[PDB]
Amino acid sequence: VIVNAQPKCNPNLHYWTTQIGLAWIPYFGPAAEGIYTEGLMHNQDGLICGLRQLANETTQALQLFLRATTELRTFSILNRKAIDFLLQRWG
Amino acid sequence: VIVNAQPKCNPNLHYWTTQIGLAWIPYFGPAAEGIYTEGLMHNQDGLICGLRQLANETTQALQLFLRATTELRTFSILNRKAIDFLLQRWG
Amino acid sequence: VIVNAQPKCNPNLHYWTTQIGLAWIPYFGPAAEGIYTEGLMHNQDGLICGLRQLANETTQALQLFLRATTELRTFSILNRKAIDFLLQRWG
Amino acid sequence: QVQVEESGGGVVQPGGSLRLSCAASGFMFSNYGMHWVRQAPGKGLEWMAFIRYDDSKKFYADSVKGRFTISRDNSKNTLYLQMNSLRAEDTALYYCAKELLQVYTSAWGEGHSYYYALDVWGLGTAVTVSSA
Amino acid sequence: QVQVEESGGGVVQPGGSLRLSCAASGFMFSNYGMHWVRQAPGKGLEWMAFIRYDDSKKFYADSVKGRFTISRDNSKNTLYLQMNSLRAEDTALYYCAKELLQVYTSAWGEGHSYYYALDVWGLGTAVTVSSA
Amino acid sequence: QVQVEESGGGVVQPGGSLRLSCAASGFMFSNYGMHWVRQAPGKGLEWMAFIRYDDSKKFYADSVKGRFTISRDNSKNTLYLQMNSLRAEDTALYYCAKELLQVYTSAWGEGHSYYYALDVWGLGTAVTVSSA
Amino acid sequence: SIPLGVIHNSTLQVSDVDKLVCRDKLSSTNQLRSVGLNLEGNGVATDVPSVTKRWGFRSGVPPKVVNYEAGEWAENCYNLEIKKPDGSECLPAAPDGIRGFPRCRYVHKVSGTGPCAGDFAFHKEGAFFLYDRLASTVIYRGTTFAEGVVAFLILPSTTIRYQATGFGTNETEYLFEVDNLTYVQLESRFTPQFLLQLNETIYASGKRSNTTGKLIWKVNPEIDTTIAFWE
Amino acid sequence: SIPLGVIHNSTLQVSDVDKLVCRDKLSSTNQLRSVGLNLEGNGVATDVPSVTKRWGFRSGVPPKVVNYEAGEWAENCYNLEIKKPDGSECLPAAPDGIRGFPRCRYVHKVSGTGPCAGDFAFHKEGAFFLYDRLASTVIYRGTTFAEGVVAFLILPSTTIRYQATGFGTNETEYLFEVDNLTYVQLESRFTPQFLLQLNETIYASGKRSNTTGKLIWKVNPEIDTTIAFWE
Amino acid sequence: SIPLGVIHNSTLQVSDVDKLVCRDKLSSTNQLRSVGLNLEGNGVATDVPSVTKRWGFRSGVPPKVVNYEAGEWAENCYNLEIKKPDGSECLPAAPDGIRGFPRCRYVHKVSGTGPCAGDFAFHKEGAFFLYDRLASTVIYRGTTFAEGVVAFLILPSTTIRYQATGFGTNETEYLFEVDNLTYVQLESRFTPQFLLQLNETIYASGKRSNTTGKLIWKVNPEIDTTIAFWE
Amino acid sequence: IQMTQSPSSVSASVGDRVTITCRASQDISNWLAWYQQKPGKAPELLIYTASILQSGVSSRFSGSGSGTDFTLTISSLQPEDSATYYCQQGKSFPYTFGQGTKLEIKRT
Amino acid sequence: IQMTQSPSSVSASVGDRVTITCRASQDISNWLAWYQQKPGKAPELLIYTASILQSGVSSRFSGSGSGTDFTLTISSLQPEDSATYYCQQGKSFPYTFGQGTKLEIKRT
Amino acid sequence: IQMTQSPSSVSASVGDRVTITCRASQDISNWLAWYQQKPGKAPELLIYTASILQSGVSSRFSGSGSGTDFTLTISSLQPEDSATYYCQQGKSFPYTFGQGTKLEIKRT
Ligand SMILES: *[C@@H]1O[C@H](CO)[C@@H](O[C@@H]2O[C@H](CO)[C@@H](O[C@@H]3O[C@H](CO[C@H]4O[C@H](CO)[C@@H](O)[C@H](O)[C@@H]4O)[C@@H](O)[C@H](O[C@H]4O[C@H](CO)[C@@H](O)[C@H](O)[C@@H]4O)[C@@H]3O)[C@H](O)[C@H]2NC(C)=O)[C@H](O)[C@H]1NC(C)=O
Ligand SMILES: *[C@@H]1O[C@H](CO)[C@@H](O[C@@H]2O[C@H](CO)[C@@H](O[C@@H]3O[C@H](CO[C@H]4O[C@H](CO)[C@@H](O)[C@H](O)[C@@H]4O)[C@@H](O)[C@H](O[C@H]4O[C@H](CO)[C@@H](O)[C@H](O)[C@@H]4O)[C@@H]3O)[C@H](O)[C@H]2NC(C)=O)[C@H](O)[C@H]1NC(C)=O
Ligand SMILES: *[C@@H]1O[C@H](CO)[C@@H](O[C@@H]2O[C@H](CO)[C@@H](O[C@@H]3O[C@H](CO[C@H]4O[C@H](CO)[C@@H](O)[C@H](O)[C@@H]4O)[C@@H](O)[C@H](O[C@H]4O[C@H](CO)[C@@H](O)[C@H](O)[C@@H]4O)[C@@H]3O)[C@H](O)[C@H]2NC(C)=O)[C@H](O)[C@H]1NC(C)=O
Ligand SMILES: *[C@@H]1O[C@H](CO)[C@@H](O[C@@H]2O[C@H](CO)[C@@H](O)[C@H](O)[C@H]2NC(C)=O)[C@H](O)[C@H]1NC(C)=O
Ligand SMILES: *[C@@H]1O[C@H](CO)[C@@H](O[C@@H]2O[C@H](CO)[C@@H](O)[C@H](O)[C@H]2NC(C)=O)[C@H](O)[C@H]1NC(C)=O
Ligand SMILES: *[C@@H]1O[C@H](CO)[C@@H](O[C@@H]2O[C@H](CO)[C@@H](O)[C@H](O)[C@H]2NC(C)=O)[C@H](O)[C@H]1NC(C)=O
Ligand SMILES: *[C@@H]1O[C@H](CO)[C@@H](O)[C@H](O)[C@H]1NC(C)=O
Ligand SMILES: *[C@@H]1O[C@H](CO)[C@@H](O)[C@H](O)[C@H]1NC(C)=O
Ligand SMILES: *[C@@H]1O[C@H](CO)[C@@H](O)[C@H](O)[C@H]1NC(C)=O
Ligand SMILES: *[C@@H]1O[C@H](CO)[C@@H](O)[C@H](O)[C@H]1NC(C)=O
Ligand SMILES: *[C@@H]1O[C@H](CO)[C@@H](O)[C@H](O)[C@H]1NC(C)=O
Ligand SMILES: *[C@@H]1O[C@H](CO)[C@@H](O)[C@H](O)[C@H]1NC(C)=O
């Protein structure tokens, strides 16, 4: 598994993400500062310490991958992972 | 099926799309205003009324999806649909 | 197979591509002019003549495809090829 | 010929109200637009208000919004101006003015020209915001 | 020493044509470029044409394109200028001019310098577009 | 009252070195910053150096970097200036200057104001870079 | 989210993005095209004073832009140049890659002034603003566009100029332009062919302005219009 | 390269990009989210003079920008305005699409001067600079951000202004701002709540500058701080 | 469209995009690289007056840009600065992300004037203009590039300056630059090593311009060139 | 929506040619007017739209210009023109205009 | 980090009102100083921070300004002011300043 | 491709120092020429390329400049220079140039 080795580990991941009655249409829609769904998740068996270590182990390799291309705004990484996944199981 | 509920439905979809002898090379190629293939398609059993209603039902949800990201020029929607399709049948 | 029909064929493909001790972190990383891995590959049974002809046969069709879109910086061609490959074998 | 005359002036207390009567004759009054132009007796001209011919729009200067109200009547051939919340700077002459246009009826439907300016001016009436 | 002389002037009708003869002697004529400069008798100078030494390029002013034709002959050591479709503003003196260069032959191959300007001028010949 | 005095001048050879002594009395010297300002006898003022009150930073002008060294001592209430590699343009008066501040101690912790300027100037000492 | 329509051999059937449809056979990504359709087939009004009540201004939301591959031949296309009354610009300039809508039977070009209160211009009913193969949710300045929407599915020139006063309010006034001193005040009921007969009759019969000033015309409530658009 | 973490029903298990894991079940691309986490949970110091030793300048490498979908509520967010001593700009302007970090408990806004020697500003330990759903490896000017990193996985408001002198060196000096003639010199140990009690006490008790000049304050080594941040 | 070449264990075999090849085994997207190759291996001429007959200007088509991952070490690389005779710019400025071609044995830098009639510069035979991992179909100003093409497949420094007069026509004249008052008129047959011996001999033997004016040199038809480039 | 004239006090003798510069803050494009206000009198129109002289006024008054910089011009000054001249516009309808120029006749 | 004054030699008689323009290459925002250097004397502070007169100096000296363009002003000139006036600043600490203006009293 | 000189009529007496300003619409970079046209005579070269005096002409003529603003200068005027001076260039080969300056000697 992934074992945390940081000095501190905050076990409370207070998180924000993105996702009626005519709120969809942008002329009546909310401003940009209020389109964020909030939520709270607690330390369910080292999961947040696990993510805090996993983010550090993927930091350097992602930095390397971003050094290796020319796109100014990379977005297609998850799709490349899915296509790699499909080819690794069947292709 | 999809049933139209608009006030009017134009059953004639006059459509334009994009697709030799050295027309490929862009120095001899046509100008930008003439690279459009035209064509005509008639109402083959409510198909054009069906599209005119389906476009209205996908309008709001697409508006929502575009509110939910940060790409200034989204292009990868069809590829996400294909990857979702592959994962829903095998992944 | 692919048969070369050019006037000359250089059978030596001297090539450059892109791919520790804190070289990953970009503040200590190399400058832009030195991130290129070099290498040398010789004519292993018409392979370089084959690529030099294949590049000419895919030149015009790629030019056509690039005329047919609106993206200022196309990058997703290989992913479209992979998704086409997956759908042609299973989808 | 064409007569444009101001009336209804005098003196008034600060914070009061009065109404002017710009009567006119000698032309088709329901087809021409009318103005109001202010001139302080120590200063120059400054525009107040403008109504169109059909009473469709009302155009007001910046320093006179809300307090001052233009209106017209094409029955008695008479322009009116209702004033409220009067101040000490408003002591002035008040001009009512007729603008220029020719009426090209030789068509399927009417219409006219403008060349935006003023020709026929009244003498001006005197309004004083004071106690005496 | 170096002589540059205009010839072939006179008077000519409007719409006519004539040819000038700029003969020169005293230097290697096949190695130097030649010019044509116009001066109206009521005005100043203005450039007309320029040919290189080897007759490779011909450079024309804007108001003289098409109508006027430069040519040279390194046999008779003589510059020529053929003129067509003459107009009333063209009544002027016509100068033919020699430019400056030193010839650095001390190499494997020849070549020269420029410092673009003019030194040896002719007197000018007179051309009149009129009836008398 | 507040006395600021220069001392240690004279004459010196080119390429030599000397030290000035700016002694001062009549105020809390360990709480005020001190300056050095140069004036050639044929020219105007120009700044040389500045030290803070606690000897934390040292600020030098551009033409005096490396060669000149500021230092202070809050024991003997005396400013010092060490000079090396002297040149012929350095023949001047050397001013040492006291700056302005009030000391607001009425708090949990100290602190002061600035309004950056100079009030109490010394007379200046004379330094000559020559042979006589 | 975002349903993929399926052209079955019979008729159009919407597919679920939650349920798994085994009847779908998708063996290319040429079988996925993103088609954009026009509102004017749905039966909305088309004339400008009955359209720009559906446009408003709003501040503080960034635009978004999606592409589409095939479109419909438009009957009406619009183009805007709106300035604030002090002289500044209202609508943002067109970015790179933005070109006009390619096939337009009529192009309503509108210039003029209005109380621009906002940062952009959105569509009040939630439709997009179709451009050269790009659907956008703003209106960029000086680029000929239509109104319409976008649907996703599996497969198997005349210029009319206007003058606008008070563009963003409810009490707006539009002017038809014939000559640069000759205007006609619009109504709600004017169709474009009637306006084409109008500038033909005006410009031929010599009733334009023969002086320096403007000349504005009215239409009596007696004269018909020439014209479900497709009958 | 770039491992995809797997939230198993027990706990988090890293998966190999070289070995084939048949225990993974991936039946959507909604099951792939790219989450960005903050450094301040790892236990780094948070105060500005203990942070901007981790920023440097360097020239001749272009920036790169990647997106992320979900983030952490930040405890500290920074914002910069650094000028060269001649008056020019140090940090590049924000491109389009760049917005500030959305949820920030405290926003350290820093302006001032420094010997800017480079073309950009990178993170010396290799972390990213999280923005509005965009991870970047530079610091753009005038946009509120945090410090942190990004991890990939399978699922199933208060403003404090500073003044900075000598921003890029090792011998730097920071100033806390109360009023535009009233400053307090920072230390290494100051927490933000102590600074909030400080401007409350200063601005209430009338000890600001009542003249034209600046007024700088020191803190005795006797007065505690108010405050593992989460205890 | 766009065939994917297959490196079989024997040799290179093109695959059909219409027929289904079961012999292909594609188990990564690291096995897909997009390689760009140079024209100078095909045997085209390389000298500038035999190359810029293959460049023209044209107006009214937007550029397109595609990337590629691996390239060939170039023997000749070009760089342009062309101005219109009134003083304006001909070629558009380089956008962000555009950098020069990285490995270049010789860099022909060309400045000068020409009757620029068009909006861009395209390649008359249909090749691309390779940049720093980006293939483009225009020529951006001031960025060192090569000429070549791109192919898709499955896997398993010296500067020479010119002066150009009349760049876009058929009757053009190029000048080799030695010193800023010392020029040599080119021919069609000059190779770059001969030009390197030429500025060595000129700059050493003292035959540059010792006055204010320019100095142009000719070469007799007696002196050979130093040099299938790879023999 | 602002407009600023030449200096307000200009003096000349009878027979002189004088000009009055009028400057506008926005582009007006020939929607200007020059009004002659004799003292004790209502003002009167001289030239509308910067080109056309109104009937009844002699030809010694003229004016022209393009865009924002227009100019009224008296050909030869007459003693019957001791008046203050105004410069009004009507483009975007707040009808704002200049402050005025009083033209003084030199009589001791 | 540069500063340039008015011309260095200004002459006036007793009772005159004179001004000295001081220009700065960067934005200083009221961190200026005006120093009076009598000949044979150390200089003395007149006005710090462009607003406050120092104690001991009479009210005939004043000065003001905003940003980079400040100006010292003598109300009425006195014969005791034959001196050269300097314009110093202290914002970004190289402490550079102007070249000086010598004010000459007109005595034959 | 345009060039505009100083005003065409300049008058001076014998012994004066005069200058002639020559302005160019494009960057020329020292490709200029100054020609002396005596009346009844062909013109003659004085200075090519803005720096070098031609042989045969005395040293009282000089000229210099950088870029588009060049200037011919006579050191001391002589009575033998009643002539019109031209300012030609040769950079981009339409060879266009100025209109000329006639220098008048003051003799009653
Ligand atoms: C409303 O209705 C009126 C008609 O009632 C329209 O007016 C017509 O406008 C068109 C478009 O501008 C005109 O067509 C053009 O006519 C030009 C001739 O006029 C020019 O030359 C005369 C010479 O004295 C000038 O006096 C005059 O001011 C013009 O400068 C032609 O030069 C044009 O040719 C060009 O386009 C054609 C298109 O195929 C090309 O083939 C040519 O090579 C060239 O490029 C063109 O023919 C037309 O004359 C006008 N009158 C009539 C009666 O039709 C209004 O335009 C219309 N407005 C709207 C908004 O619909
Ligand atoms: C450090 O600590 C001090 C307190 O010790 C803080 O000072 C407070 O700052 C806030 C923010 O500016 C102040 O709150 C505002 O007060 C305004 C009233 O003052 C204005 O009007 C008076 C009238 O004479 C002027 O003299 C004065 O100069 C001001 O112009 C209100 O107008 C504000 O209302 C606005 O915001 C509220 C927010 O909800 C809205 O509801 C309102 O509609 C309106 O938009 C606001 O209330 C506060 O007064 C200051 N003092 C105190 C004692 O709290 C420093 O800001 C703080 N600094 C830092 C960096 O933390
Ligand atoms: C055509 O051929 C000639 C040779 O025949 C070339 O001329 C050589 O050009 C190179 C490149 O500029 C020169 O190399 C440099 O020399 C400099 C010394 O000259 C400078 O200093 C003198 C001192 O009086 C000045 O008079 C003179 O004007 C110069 O300013 C060095 O300073 C350079 O060093 C730099 O680069 C090296 C590269 O490694 C670094 O190591 C250094 O630290 C420093 O950064 C450099 O050495 C050379 O001197 C020239 N002459 C010869 C005989 O080789 C033309 O350049 C060439 N043209 C083309 C287009 O090919
Ligand atoms: C411009 O045209 C209009 C009509 O198209 C002219 O107005 C009419 O001119 C006739 C000429 O005798 C008069 O009888 C009418 O009374 C006029 N009508 C009106 C309403 O006044 C006008 O004169 C023309 N102007 C010019 C300058 O040509
Ligand atoms: C510049 O150099 C050239 C040759 O490299 C010189 O030209 C020759 O100079 C010699 C010197 O006696 C003469 O004998 C030759 O006749 C000259 N050649 C020509 C074609 O004239 C030139 O003099 C040098 N100039 C300077 C200023 O140094
Ligand atoms: C500004 O406030 C400070 C203190 O907050 C004042 O300084 C003190 O003022 C009292 C008033 O009698 C004196 O007794 C003290 O000696 C002062 N302290 C110092 C260090 O000088 C100051 O006077 C106030 N200034 C203004 C203009 O109000
Ligand atoms: C337009 O909106 C304003 C805003 O309140 C309102 O006062 C006015 O009556 C409205 N007019 C119409 C015609 O709707
Ligand atoms: C209208 O257009 C014509 C066409 O040349 C032009 O001459 C005239 O000045 C224009 N008038 C206005 C008011 O723009
Ligand atoms: C800061 O760095 C400089 C660079 O050499 C060094 O001289 C100085 O001593 C350093 N100071 C500290 C406190 O590290
Ligand atoms: C500080 O802010 C106040 C607020 O209005 C302002 O009046 C004052 O001039 C400011 N002072 C400085 C030095 O910026
Ligand atoms: C170049 O093209 C022009 C265009 O017509 C032609 O006149 C000329 O003869 C051509 N010259 C050569 C050498 O091809
Ligand atoms: C050529 O370059 C040298 C190098 O310093 C320079 O001094 C000279 O002025 C240049 N000449 C021209 C004509 O640019």
mmCIF file of N, CA and C in Angstrom, chain F residues 52-54 56-57 59 102-116, chain H residues 171-173 185 198 201-202 207-208 210-220 223:
data_model
loop_
_atom_site.group_PDB
_atom_site.id
_atom_site.type_symbol
_atom_site.label_atom_id
_atom_site.label_comp_id
_atom_site.label_asym_id
_atom_site.label_seq_id
_atom_site.Cartn_x
_atom_site.Cartn_y
_atom_site.Cartn_z
ATOM 1 N N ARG F 52 21.538 51.931 9.437
ATOM 2 C CA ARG F 52 20.385 51.994 10.316
ATOM 3 C C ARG F 52 20.831 52.132 11.760
ATOM 4 N N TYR F 53 19.855 52.108 12.661
ATOM 5 C CA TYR F 53 20.180 52.339 14.059
ATOM 6 C C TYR F 53 20.810 51.114 14.705
ATOM 7 N N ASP F 54 20.371 49.918 14.331
ATOM 8 C CA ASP F 54 20.781 48.696 15.005
ATOM 9 C C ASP F 54 21.948 47.995 14.324
ATOM 10 N N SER F 56 21.912 46.843 11.098
ATOM 11 C CA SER F 56 21.373 45.682 10.415
ATOM 12 C C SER F 56 21.636 45.726 8.925
ATOM 13 N N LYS F 57 21.447 46.884 8.306
ATOM 14 C CA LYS F 57 21.669 47.049 6.883
ATOM 15 C C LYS F 57 22.674 48.160 6.654
ATOM 16 N N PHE F 59 23.620 50.781 3.367
ATOM 17 C CA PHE F 59 23.194 51.211 2.044
ATOM 18 C C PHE F 59 24.230 52.149 1.450
ATOM 19 N N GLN F 102 10.418 60.291 15.533
ATOM 20 C CA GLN F 102 9.941 60.306 16.906
ATOM 21 C C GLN F 102 9.792 58.873 17.387
ATOM 22 N N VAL F 103 9.982 58.671 18.681
ATOM 23 C CA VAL F 103 10.083 57.336 19.252
ATOM 24 C C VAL F 103 8.812 57.053 20.041
ATOM 25 N N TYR F 104 7.890 56.310 19.445
ATOM 26 C CA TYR F 104 6.610 56.015 20.079
ATOM 27 C C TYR F 104 6.769 54.761 20.917
ATOM 28 N N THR F 105 7.126 54.929 22.183
ATOM 29 C CA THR F 105 7.290 53.796 23.077
ATOM 30 C C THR F 105 5.999 53.396 23.753
ATOM 31 N N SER F 106 4.958 54.219 23.652
ATOM 32 C CA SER F 106 3.708 53.992 24.370
ATOM 33 C C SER F 106 2.937 52.862 23.691
ATOM 34 N N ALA F 107 3.428 51.645 23.910
ATOM 35 C CA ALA F 107 2.807 50.444 23.376
ATOM 36 C C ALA F 107 3.333 49.233 24.126
ATOM 37 N N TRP F 108 2.883 48.072 23.668
ATOM 38 C CA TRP F 108 3.439 46.788 24.051
ATOM 39 C C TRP F 108 4.854 46.599 23.533
ATOM 40 N N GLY F 109 5.187 47.206 22.402
ATOM 41 C CA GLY F 109 6.513 47.086 21.828
ATOM 42 C C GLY F 109 6.865 48.377 21.128
ATOM 43 N N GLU F 110 8.163 48.602 20.969
ATOM 44 C CA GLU F 110 8.632 49.888 20.492
ATOM 45 C C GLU F 110 8.439 50.034 18.993
ATOM 46 N N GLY F 111 8.957 51.126 18.476
ATOM 47 C CA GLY F 111 8.823 51.418 17.071
ATOM 48 C C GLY F 111 8.915 52.906 16.890
ATOM 49 N N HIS F 112 9.144 53.307 15.652
ATOM 50 C CA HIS F 112 9.327 54.723 15.413
ATOM 51 C C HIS F 112 8.848 55.072 14.020
ATOM 52 N N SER F 113 8.864 56.365 13.733
ATOM 53 C CA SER F 113 8.428 56.927 12.469
ATOM 54 C C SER F 113 9.641 57.301 11.632
ATOM 55 N N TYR F 114 9.417 57.675 10.375
ATOM 56 C CA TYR F 114 10.578 58.236 9.701
ATOM 57 C C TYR F 114 10.409 59.637 9.129
ATOM 58 N N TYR F 115 9.521 59.797 8.142
ATOM 59 C CA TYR F 115 9.507 60.946 7.232
ATOM 60 C C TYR F 115 10.918 61.289 6.750
ATOM 61 N N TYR F 116 11.427 60.480 5.816
ATOM 62 C CA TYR F 116 12.831 60.441 5.409
ATOM 63 C C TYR F 116 13.369 61.787 4.958
ATOM 64 N N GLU H 171 18.383 37.907 1.911
ATOM 65 C CA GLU H 171 18.288 38.937 2.941
ATOM 66 C C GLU H 171 17.097 39.841 2.639
ATOM 67 N N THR H 172 15.920 39.331 2.959
ATOM 68 C CA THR H 172 14.678 40.001 2.621
ATOM 69 C C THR H 172 14.036 40.580 3.876
ATOM 70 N N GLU H 173 13.155 41.556 3.676
ATOM 71 C CA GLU H 173 12.429 42.183 4.771
ATOM 72 C C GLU H 173 10.968 42.331 4.400
ATOM 73 N N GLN H 185 6.730 45.486 11.389
ATOM 74 C CA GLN H 185 7.715 44.574 10.842
ATOM 75 C C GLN H 185 7.426 43.155 11.298
ATOM 76 N N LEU H 198 -3.594 42.242 16.110
ATOM 77 C CA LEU H 198 -2.702 43.383 16.076
ATOM 78 C C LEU H 198 -3.340 44.566 15.361
ATOM 79 N N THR H 201 -6.052 46.011 17.618
ATOM 80 C CA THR H 201 -5.577 46.802 18.746
ATOM 81 C C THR H 201 -4.992 48.129 18.281
ATOM 82 N N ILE H 202 -4.240 48.107 17.179
ATOM 83 C CA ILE H 202 -3.631 49.325 16.654
ATOM 84 C C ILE H 202 -4.692 50.279 16.137
ATOM 85 N N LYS H 207 -3.181 54.406 17.715
ATOM 86 C CA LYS H 207 -1.735 54.463 17.591
ATOM 87 C C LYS H 207 -1.266 54.421 16.152
ATOM 88 N N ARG H 208 -2.105 54.798 15.198
ATOM 89 C CA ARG H 208 -1.616 54.913 13.839
ATOM 90 C C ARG H 208 -0.860 56.220 13.654
ATOM 91 N N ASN H 210 -0.264 59.806 12.885
ATOM 92 C CA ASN H 210 -1.016 61.055 12.844
ATOM 93 C C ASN H 210 -0.244 62.178 12.154
ATOM 94 N N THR H 211 0.829 61.844 11.450
ATOM 95 C CA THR H 211 1.593 62.786 10.645
ATOM 96 C C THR H 211 1.706 62.255 9.217
ATOM 97 N N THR H 212 2.532 62.912 8.410
ATOM 98 C CA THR H 212 2.665 62.526 7.015
ATOM 99 C C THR H 212 3.544 61.309 6.802
ATOM 100 N N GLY H 213 4.479 61.029 7.708
ATOM 101 C CA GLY H 213 5.461 59.990 7.500
ATOM 102 C C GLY H 213 4.944 58.604 7.851
ATOM 103 N N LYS H 214 5.727 57.602 7.464
ATOM 104 C CA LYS H 214 5.424 56.234 7.843
ATOM 105 C C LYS H 214 5.679 56.037 9.321
ATOM 106 N N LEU H 215 5.195 54.918 9.832
ATOM 107 C CA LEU H 215 5.337 54.562 11.232
ATOM 108 C C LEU H 215 5.498 53.059 11.314
ATOM 109 N N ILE H 216 6.669 52.608 11.730
ATOM 110 C CA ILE H 216 6.976 51.190 11.757
ATOM 111 C C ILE H 216 7.090 50.767 13.216
ATOM 112 N N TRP H 217 6.596 49.576 13.523
ATOM 113 C CA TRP H 217 6.503 49.089 14.889
ATOM 114 C C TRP H 217 7.303 47.809 15.035
ATOM 115 N N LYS H 218 7.816 47.582 16.228
ATOM 116 C CA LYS H 218 8.430 46.310 16.551
ATOM 117 C C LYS H 218 7.601 45.606 17.606
ATOM 118 N N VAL H 219 7.808 44.307 17.716
ATOM 119 C CA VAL H 219 7.149 43.505 18.727
ATOM 120 C C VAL H 219 8.227 42.987 19.657
ATOM 121 N N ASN H 220 8.020 43.151 20.957
ATOM 122 C CA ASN H 220 8.973 42.638 21.926
ATOM 123 C C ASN H 220 8.977 41.115 21.891
ATOM 124 N N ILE H 223 5.527 38.525 23.716
ATOM 125 C CA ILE H 223 4.104 38.449 23.424
ATOM 126 C C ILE H 223 3.857 37.238 22.537
#
